Amino acid sequence: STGSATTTPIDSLDDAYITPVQIGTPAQTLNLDFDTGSSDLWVFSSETTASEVDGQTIYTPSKSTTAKLLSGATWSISYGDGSSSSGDVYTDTVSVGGLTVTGQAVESAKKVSSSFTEDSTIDGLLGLAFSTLNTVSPTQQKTFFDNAKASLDSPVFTADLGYHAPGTYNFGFIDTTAYTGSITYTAVSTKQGFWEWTSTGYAVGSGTFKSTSIDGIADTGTTLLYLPATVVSAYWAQVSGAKSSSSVGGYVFPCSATLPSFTFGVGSARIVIPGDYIDFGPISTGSSSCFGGIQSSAGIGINIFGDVALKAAFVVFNGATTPTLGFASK
Numbered sequence: 298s299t300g301s302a303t304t305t306p307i308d309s310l311d312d313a314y315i316t317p318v319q320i321g322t323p324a325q326t327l328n329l330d331f332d333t334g335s336s337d338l339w340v341f342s343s344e345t346t347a348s349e350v351d352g353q354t355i356y357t358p359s360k361s362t363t364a365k366l367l368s369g370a371t372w373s374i375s376y377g378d379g380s381s382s383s384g385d386v387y388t389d390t391v392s393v394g395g396l397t398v399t400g401q402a403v404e405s406a407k408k409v410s411s412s413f414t415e416d417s418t419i420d421g422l423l424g425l426a427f428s429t430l431n432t433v434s435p436t437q438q439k440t441f442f443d444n445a446k447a448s449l450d451s452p453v454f455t456a457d458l459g460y461h462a463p464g465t466y467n468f469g470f471i472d473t474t475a476y477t478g479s480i481t482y483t484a485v486s487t488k489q490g491f492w493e494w495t496s497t498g499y500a501v502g503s504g505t506f507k508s509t510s511i512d513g514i515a516d517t518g519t520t521l522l523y524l525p526a527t528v529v530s531a532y533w534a535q536v537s538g539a540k541s542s543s544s545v546g547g548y549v550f551p552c553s554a555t556l557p558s559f560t561f562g563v564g565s566a567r568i569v570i571p572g573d574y575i576d577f578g579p580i581s582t583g584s585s586s587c588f589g590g591i592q593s594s595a596g597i598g599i600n601i602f603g604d605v606a607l608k609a610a611f612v613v614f615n616g617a618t619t620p621t622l623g624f625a626s627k
């Protein structure tokens with residue numbers, strides 16, 4: 298089997314991408330944030346505290362003839378930004394882009410944090426990291442991809458995120474028309490449950506490539522590119538007037554600036570992020586200070602190749618027995 302679904306930016310900045318997902322019978326379509334940095338499929342639901350729902354589409358398990366309470370199971374997830382959600386668990390039929398999994402754990406939110414409530418466009422998350430990170434207790438549950446894998450033509454999914462435009466998530470096949478040149482594959486460590494890999498270096502603009510190992514994760518659920526402070530300082534030093542602002546929470550730059558590109562290495566291959574992808578617009582409406590798309594990872598504990606980086610590439614998440622990542626230009 299295969300599946301193919303369009304993923305659409307939630308706003309004009311590509312802050313996140315939403316993909317329609319069919320849950321239950323008859324189908325209830327929710328727009329989920331596909332997140333290769335987490336491993337829970339959770340949704341706003343008829344069980345979510347009413348004051349914490351503000352425009353999201355909800356899953357109502359009582360209206361699905363295929364829903365079954367997973368008795369005793371609960372979940373609770375704290376994310377890197379301090380956001381959280383928690384609740385109980387149903388199994389139900391879940392389809393993405395024509396690919397159907399029966400018996401998928403659908404984690405129904407009883408509580409969500411302000412960052413989700415304030416985001417009327419995101420109806421939940423579909424985790425695509427390794428199932429060892431799934432938070433369901435006392436019986437950990439598998440991700441949608443892990444449940445689908447055996448049925449797929451090939452045990453892979455691909456992320457093709459657009460810049461200020463829709464893109465595609467494919468399951469089970471590699472669309473050879475969706476990228477240019479060749480795909481360069483690189484080793485993955487699953488020891489932290491992430492799609493963790495080592496970039497071979499970077500360049501700023503037309504500058505020379507610096508060969509240096511940068512361990513980080515491929516995370517579709519993170520907006521920006523978070524890298525070591527040395528790398529980030531080298532980038533922003535090429536933008537007149539750019540500075541790190543403790544009050545804003547990262548590097549800002551004059552909105553009148555033209556940003557240089559940023560290149561990252563994948564083995565001997567190079568992925569170029571155009572400068573425009575690094576502009577996240579005014580820090581507040583009307584401001585001439587703009588927020589940068591490359592930020593320091595120093596306070597995180599891990600480097601994160603988020604959407605800013607991934608949208609510059611066609612990315613293969615190869616879930617074979619020994620997983621690997623592939624990157625191609627496009």
Ligand SMILES: Cc1cc(CNCCS(C)(=O)=O)ccc1Br
Nearest residue numbers: 313376377378380412413518519
């Ligand atoms: C939309 C959304 C998604 C996620 C999942 N990824 C978060 C990545 S990080 C580096 O910020 O911890 C959390 C919160 C919201 Br709100």
